[PDB]
Amino acid sequence: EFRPEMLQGKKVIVTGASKGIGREMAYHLAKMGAHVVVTARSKETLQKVVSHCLELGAASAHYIAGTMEDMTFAEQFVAQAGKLMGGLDMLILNHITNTSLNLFHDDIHHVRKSMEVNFLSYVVLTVAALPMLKQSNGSIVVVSSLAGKVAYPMVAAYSASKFALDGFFSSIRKEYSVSRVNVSITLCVLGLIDTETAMKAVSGIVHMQAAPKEECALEIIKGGALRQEEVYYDSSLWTTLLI
Amino acid sequence: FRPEMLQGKKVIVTGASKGIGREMAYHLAKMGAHVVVTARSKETLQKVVSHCLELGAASAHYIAGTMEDMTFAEQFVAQAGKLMGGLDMLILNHITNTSLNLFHDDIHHVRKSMEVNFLSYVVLTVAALPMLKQSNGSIVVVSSLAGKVAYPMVAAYSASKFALDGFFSSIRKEYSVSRVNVSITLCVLGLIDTETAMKAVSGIVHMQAAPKEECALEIIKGGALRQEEVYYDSSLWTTLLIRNPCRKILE
Ligand SMILES: NC(=O)c1ccc[n+]([C@@H]2O[C@H](COP(=O)([O-])OP(=O)(O)OC[C@H]3O[C@@H](n4cnc5c(N)ncnc54)[C@H](OP(=O)(O)O)[C@@H]3O)[C@@H](O)[C@H]2O)c1
Numbered sequence: 001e002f003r004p005e006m007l008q009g010k011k012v013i014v015t016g017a018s019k020g021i022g023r024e025m026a027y028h029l030a031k032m033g034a035h036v037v038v039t040a041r042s043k044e045t046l047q048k049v050v051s052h053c054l055e056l057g058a059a060s061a062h063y064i065a066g067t068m069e070d071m072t073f074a075e076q077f078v079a080q081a082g083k084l085m086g087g088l089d090m091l092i093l094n095h096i097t098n099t100s101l102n103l104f105h106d107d108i109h110h111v112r113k114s115m116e117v118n119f120l121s122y123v124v125l126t127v128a129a130l131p132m133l134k135q136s137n138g139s140i141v142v143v144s145s146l147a148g149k150v151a152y153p154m155v156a157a158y159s160a161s162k163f164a165l166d167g168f169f170s171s172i173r174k175e176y177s178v179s180r181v182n183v184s185i186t187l188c189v190l191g192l193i194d195t196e197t198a199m200k201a202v203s204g205i206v207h208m209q210a211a212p213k214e215e216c217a218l219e220i221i222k223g224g225a226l227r228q229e230e231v232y233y234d235s236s237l238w239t240t241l242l243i
Numbered sequence: 244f245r246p247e248m249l250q251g252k253k254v255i256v257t258g259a260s261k262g263i264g265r266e267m268a269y270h271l272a273k274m275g276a277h278v279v280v281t282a283r284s285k286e287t288l289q290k291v292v293s294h295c296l297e298l299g300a301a302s303a304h305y306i307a308g309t310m311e312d313m314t315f316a317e318q319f320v321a322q323a324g325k326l327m328g329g330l331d332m333l334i335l336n337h338i339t340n341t342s343l344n345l346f347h348d349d350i351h352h353v354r355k356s357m358e359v360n361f362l363s364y365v366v367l368t369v370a371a372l373p374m375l376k377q378s379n380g381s382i383v384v385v386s387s388l389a390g391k392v393a394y395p396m397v398a399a400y401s402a403s404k405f406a407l408d409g410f411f412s413s414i415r416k417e418y419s420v421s422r423v424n425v426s427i428t429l430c431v432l433g434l435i436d437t438e439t440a441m442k443a444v445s446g447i448v449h450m451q452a453a454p455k456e457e458c459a460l461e462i463i464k465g466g467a468l469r470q471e472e473v474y475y476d477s478s479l480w481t482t483l484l485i486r487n488p489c490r491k492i493l494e
């Protein structure tokens with residue numbers, strides 16, 4: 001049974017946190033009394049999230065801006081975050097490269113960049129974070145998609161990258177299990193969440209009610225805190241994916 | 244399925260210097276296909292080409308190169324096309340060398356696995372699709388039980404094979420609606436008795452490896468019949484559609 005005090009004084013990194021689900025997550029952590037280090041590319045907007053986080057009562061809150069295309073930024077970012085907080089209890093990998101509904105023809109560039117940002121950078125961040133997570137018996141949260149479990153048209157490169165996440169992280173979870181590494185891995189399968197990005201994307205299709213990003217963010221946090229292997233949001237997916 | 248379905252058909256096989264790819268090359272040869280085989284080693288490929296001709300291929304050639312080089316990948320399909328006068332089936336089977344190890348910090352390997360086992364396949368598909376569109380042909384993608392189910396020691400490998408499922412399963416859906424008549428077959432294979440695999444599972448407890456010759460054939464049949472997925476061996480579906488869903492729904 002989750003309680004907010006579980007996050008109190010915890011040292012959390014949230015990526016892709018200038019907007020959408022990431023920013024809701026940071027705000028939730030702040031309200032709970034965690035320390036937070038947020039990142040995205042956009043300085044001014046990260047500062048907005050930081051000051052609001054402080055207002056909500058974050059134990060502490062800092063941003064570091066950069067792109068997750070740059071693997072050197074990824075490594076460095078982690079080193080520098082753990083330093084600001086003096087440690088690391090939870091790594092929330094949430095960011096994603098810009099993607100719209102397109103049929104696949106010849107855009108290998110988009111395919112490689114999707115894999116780099118949505119997947120490769122998650123591996124680099126994990127490798128960098130692992131020493132701190134080991135010492136704190138901490139937690140990794142990887143944010144994926146129903147289209148990382150079931151394939152959909154018009155998002156081939158995206159699905160490839162989200163599938164890759166399932167492939168990699170579930171595998172290292174079995175490895176951490178056999179190697180007695182006390183670091184949890186939570187994979188989040190999300191449906192349609194009402195972020196501006198996702199709603200812009202789906203204006204042209206028939207879909208069910210998008211789920212609120214505030215609640216989505218909360219259920220992610222809860223799942224990671226409780227060290228659940230997989231989180232389904234909205235909850236009615238849980239029945240889909242297992243039937 | 245009848246062997247006659249492959250006669251005079253123009254087929255590419257990657258990673259055909261040995262293991263399952265070589266057996267597919269030989270089966271297609273016995274059926275009277277045109278084949279173009281590829282891998283890094285010309286001497287091993289020349290031996291495959293020789294035996295294909297003796298088995299009765301309508302024609303057989305190789306082109307040597309590495310699939311780390313996306314330029315080679317793209318130009319390979321073109322040369323293979325012109326050599327056969329066309330393309331009916333593309334069999335994407337190659338894989339970068341991998342051994343069972345705990346992941347620690349080999350980002351080179353994660354990246355190289357992804358370039359060779361997934362991206363090259365996409366480059367190959369892009370290069371081939373125009374010929375495949377003209378012939379209402381077929382793409383066969385060779386994956387793995389570890390491309391559906393979680394195993395330790397194979398993190399980078401699994402990510403790359405999972406990526407294949409995601410990508411090709413997505414474009415299959417696109418092609419159905421756009422009415423692009425190119426079939427996409429994803430093969431999920433268990434342990435197959437190729438030298439690479441047997442060297443890898445050496446001293447591990449396991450069910451008898453399935454024969455590499457029968458594997459190759461079931462792959463060719465699945466693609467020839469335009470099946471969305473092939474499972475080999477036959478025992479594999481009980482794990483995939485029964486055991487795994489239960490383990491999941493229990494946790
Ligand atoms: N919303 C949904 O319906 C939905 C569904 C399934 C899964 N998800 C997943 O949930 C997560 C967040 O989704 P969302 O809707 O919140 O997305 P979002 O609102 O578009 O936010 C994406 C975040 O990532 C950052 N970002 C983009 N490119 C970056 C780059 N190159 N380097 C570093 N940061 C970058 C963005 O900030 P900057 O632009 O300032 O860099 C932003 O903070 C993703 O993993 C997504 O796949 C969402």
Ligand SMILES: NC(=O)c1ccc[n+]([C@@H]2O[C@H](COP(=O)([O-])OP(=O)(O)OC[C@H]3O[C@@H](n4cnc5c(N)ncnc54)[C@H](OP(=O)(O)O)[C@@H]3O)[C@@H](O)[C@H]2O)c1
Nearest residue numbers: 258259260262263282283284309310387434435437439440
């Ligand atoms: N055997 C199994 O139990 C098993 C199980 C599940 C899935 N599979 C899948 O089945 C497929 C074939 O497996 P296998 O056991 O037959 O493998 P294998 O005997 O080791 O053969 C691999 C082939 O790929 C080629 N290759 C390796 N690196 C290459 C590169 N950089 N560029 C171009 N070609 C390269 C090799 O030739 P060169 O070295 O001369 O380049 C060889 O022809 C793979 O997709 C594998 O994942 C196998």
Ligand SMILES: CC1(C)[C@@H](OC(=O)CCC(=O)O)CC[C@]2(C)[C@H]3C(=O)C=C4[C@@H]5C[C@@](C)(C(=O)O)CC[C@]5(C)CC[C@@]4(C)[C@]3(C)CC[C@@H]12
Nearest residue numbers: 096099145146147152155158190191192197198201207208
């Ligand atoms: C099938 C439904 C409708 C949904 O279905 C349900 O929830 C119940 C069924 C229903 O509603 O009919 C489950 C999620 C989903 C499969 C959904 C998804 O997974 C991830 C994204 C991405 C979100 C985002 C922000 C990114 O992740 O970068 C931007 C790019 C991208 C690719 C845009 C499109 C959607 C929103 C995408 C594919 C649209 C279709 C959608």
Ligand SMILES: [Cl-]
Nearest residue numbers: 019020195196
């Ligand atoms: Cl938003």
Ligand SMILES: [Cl-]
Nearest residue numbers: 261262437438
């Ligand atoms: Cl062999």
